From a paper:
We then determined structures for chicken KDELR2 bound to HDEL and RDEL signals. These structures with TAEHDEL and TAERDEL peptides have resolutions of 2.24 and 2.31 Å, respectively. Both HDEL and RDEL peptides are bound in a vertical orientation with respect to the membrane, with the side chains clearly resolved in the electron density map. Superimposing the three peptides reveals little movement of the peptide at the −1 and −2 positions when bound to the receptor. For RDEL, we observe slight movement of the backbone Cα atom of the peptide to accommodate the larger arginine side chain, resulting in a minor repositioning of the glutamate at the −3 position in the receptor. Nonetheless, the position of the positive charge at the −4 position on all three peptides is identical relative to E117 and W120 within the receptor, supporting the view that a salt bridge is formed with E117 on TM5. For RDEL, the arginine side chain sits in the same position as the amine group of KDEL and could thus interact with W120 via a cation-π interaction and E117 via a classical salt bridge interaction. We therefore conclude that both E117 and W120 play a role in retrieval signal binding, and the only major difference between HDEL, RDEL, and KDEL is the precise nature of the interaction with W120 indicating that this may be a critical residue to explain the differences in affinity.
In the archetypal KDEL-retrieval system, a seven-transmembrane receptor captures escaped ER luminal proteins carrying a C-terminal KDEL or variant tetrapeptide sequence in the mildly acidic pH of the Golgi. Signal binding to a luminal cavity in the receptor triggers a conformational change in its cytoplasmic face, exposing a lysine motif recognised by the COP I coat complex. Our previous work has shown the KDEL receptor has a transporter-like architecture and undergoes pH-dependent closure around cognate retrieval signals.
Author numbering: 1 to 212
The structure:
């Protein structure tokens, strides 16, 4: 553990709770891409199969279970409990264009040709593009509520802090994983437009339009 990974992980949990309580309290999933939430749920399901093979720490086990629980819980609120407010007409991103290529790439570009390693690699490739349906839906519809931009900020900030974590771990422990780093850089660069607009508009009381 270093303070970058921990703050990244706290940023990630914050993101997930904010989105969960926004939907819970307002009893609506207005402006939320169900499809992005399916992808995050699929990312945690393929990444955390090592719950069955490895005990790292109680923290590590706990967060994996919290992340899995909240991801499935968010998909439940969107597609069952509050489906009445699910804007299916504007959440039109074709997710097959992420899943099939990422699946294909996870099979051909990996550290090891075993089922657990391939599914991990899949989790890492998929997380890098998981937010595109959410960002596309905002580009399409008018704007995002303030609370949604805060979710996107903290989610975006989480993997940005992992990059710093990876700099720290390379310098200090000689640890490097180029599949996680490259995917991490893709994941983070996809938040650049949103980050700019969040700083210059949302933190200045303006709202955050992404034309296209």
């Amino acid at each position: 553990m270093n303070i970058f990974r921990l703050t990244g992980d706290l940023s990630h949990l914050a993101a997930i709770i904010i989105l969960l309580l926004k939907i819970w309290k307002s009893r609506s999933c207005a402006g939320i891409s169900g499809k992005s939430q399916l992808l995050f749920a699929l990312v945690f399901t393929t990444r955390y199969l090592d719950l069955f093979t490895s005990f790292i720490s109680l923290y590590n086990t706990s967060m994996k279970l919290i992340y899995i629980a909240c991801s499935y819980a968010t998909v439940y609120l969107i597609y069952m409990k509050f489906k009445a407010t699910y804007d299916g007409n504007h959440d039109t991103f074709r997710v097959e264009f992420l899943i099939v290529p990422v699946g294909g790439l996870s099979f051909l570009v990996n550290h090891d040709f075993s089922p657990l390693e391939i599914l991990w690699t899949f989790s890492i490739y998929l997380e890098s593009v998981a937010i595109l349906p959410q960002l596309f839906m905002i580009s399409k519809t008018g704007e995002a509520e303030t609370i949604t931009t805060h979710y996107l900020f903290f989610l975006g900030l989480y993997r940005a802090l992992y990059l710093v974590n990876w700099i720290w771990r390379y310098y200090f422990e000689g640890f490097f994983d180029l599949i996680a780093v490259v995917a991490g850089v893709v994941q983070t660069v996809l938040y650049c437009d949103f980050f700019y607009l969040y700083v210059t508009k949302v933190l200045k009381g303006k709202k955050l339009s992404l034309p296209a």
